Design an enzyme around this catalytic site. Sequence first.
Site, PDB file in Angstrom:
ATOM      1  N   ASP A  39      -1.875  15.794 -48.501  1.00 57.77           N
ATOM      2  CA  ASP A  39      -2.283  15.117 -47.485  1.00 57.77           C
ATOM      3  C   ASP A  39      -2.689  13.810 -47.414  1.00 57.77           C
ATOM      4  O   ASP A  39      -2.162  13.163 -48.198  1.00 57.77           O
ATOM      5  CB  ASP A  39      -3.479  16.086 -47.110  1.00 57.77           C
ATOM      6  CG  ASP A  39      -3.602  16.448 -45.591  1.00 57.77           C
ATOM      7  OD1 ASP A  39      -4.037  15.501 -44.930  1.00 57.77           O
ATOM      8  OD2 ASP A  39      -3.287  17.368 -45.031  1.00 57.77           O
ATOM      9  N   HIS A  69      -8.666  13.992 -42.651  1.00 61.54           N
ATOM     10  CA  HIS A  69      -7.747  15.192 -42.463  1.00 61.54           C
ATOM     11  C   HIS A  69      -7.852  16.002 -43.829  1.00 61.54           C
ATOM     12  O   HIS A  69      -8.226  17.113 -43.683  1.00 61.54           O
ATOM     13  CB  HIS A  69      -6.463  14.680 -41.802  1.00 61.54           C
ATOM     14  CG  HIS A  69      -5.584  15.866 -41.387  1.00 61.54           C
ATOM     15  ND1 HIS A  69      -4.694  16.193 -42.486  1.00 61.54           N
ATOM     16  CD2 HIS A  69      -5.404  16.456 -40.435  1.00 61.54           C
ATOM     17  CE1 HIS A  69      -3.812  17.300 -41.965  1.00 61.54           C
ATOM     18  NE2 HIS A  69      -4.300  17.380 -40.664  1.00 61.54           N
ATOM     19  N   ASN A 161       2.127  21.926 -34.251  1.00 60.56           N
ATOM     20  CA  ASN A 161       1.017  21.903 -33.147  1.00 60.56           C
ATOM     21  C   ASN A 161       1.756  21.582 -31.681  1.00 60.56           C
ATOM     22  O   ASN A 161       1.286  20.999 -30.849  1.00 60.56           O
ATOM     23  CB  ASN A 161      -0.210  20.950 -33.217  1.00 60.56           C
ATOM     24  CG  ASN A 161      -0.793  21.187 -34.562  1.00 60.56           C
ATOM     25  OD1 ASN A 161      -1.007  22.290 -34.880  1.00 60.56           O
ATOM     26  ND2 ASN A 161      -1.432  19.985 -35.304  1.00 60.56           N
ATOM     27  N   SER A 224      -2.816  22.675 -39.076  1.00 61.12           N
ATOM     28  CA  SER A 224      -3.472  22.139 -40.242  1.00 61.12           C
ATOM     29  C   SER A 224      -4.857  22.913 -40.753  1.00 61.12           C
ATOM     30  O   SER A 224      -4.808  22.662 -41.991  1.00 61.12           O
ATOM     31  CB  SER A 224      -3.893  20.630 -40.006  1.00 61.12           C
ATOM     32  OG  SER A 224      -2.620  19.841 -39.939  1.00 61.12           O
TER      33      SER A 224
END
Length: 279
Positions: A39, A69, A161, A224
């Site tokens: 990530d 994130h 998403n 996520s």
Amino acid sequence: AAQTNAPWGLARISSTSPGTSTYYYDESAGQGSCVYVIDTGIEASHPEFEGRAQMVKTYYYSSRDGNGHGTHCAGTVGSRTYGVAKKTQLFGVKVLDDNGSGQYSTIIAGMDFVASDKNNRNCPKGVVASLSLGGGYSSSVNSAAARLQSSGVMVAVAAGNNNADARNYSPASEPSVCTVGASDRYDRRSSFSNYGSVLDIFGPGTDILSTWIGGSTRSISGTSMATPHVAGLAAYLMTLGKTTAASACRYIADTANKGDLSNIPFGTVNLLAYNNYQA
């Protein structure tokens, strides 16, 4: 063990019903397992990680998470308050820059890195990788995720998403990895969650409280956020000896809460991750 006033998603994964707020789990808590968070990095100094997180690789000028994130996702895997597997070891691989972007070539290199790097780590209970990232379909990206899984790592990836069929996204569309959709606290499919036959499981993804950079916390939404619930669950179940990296996705599907989510399109699994812990 019981964690009172837990984030709703933790309570959800140990419950046969929505609407409760205590997370119940075996005290082994993923000890002896390892989860790679591929990530934007992890703020390993966050008190919530208790020294159990470390950066092992970056492709950029720093290994620090300048975004948040990756720290949020790592917190859902394994932070003391916000995590599923509260005693796992967390390894950060920074394939995304501080804007949250990354080239597929870098992401592929990061997956191949994990497949080798696990041989440099002590993970007697097994190895998981959490990939809260993706883009358009790429056979090369899917193949990299397949290699990582084949090497003996439980790979959990975000469905995406786009409120669309995940078959058109990577690594979401790779059949051999565990593709995770998102749900909300009322057991509804999250409004943004991708769907389709390639999904294996849903996890909590709307309004998920976890760690953030600057030693902080915040609530955000996405597939996520659902993915690290499943990654942490896999690590927890592997530590218990109930499953293995190669079989954990199927085991999680086998033991999931079934038929409880609303707005699941015909042809998408109606399965919500569940730890089946009996206190």
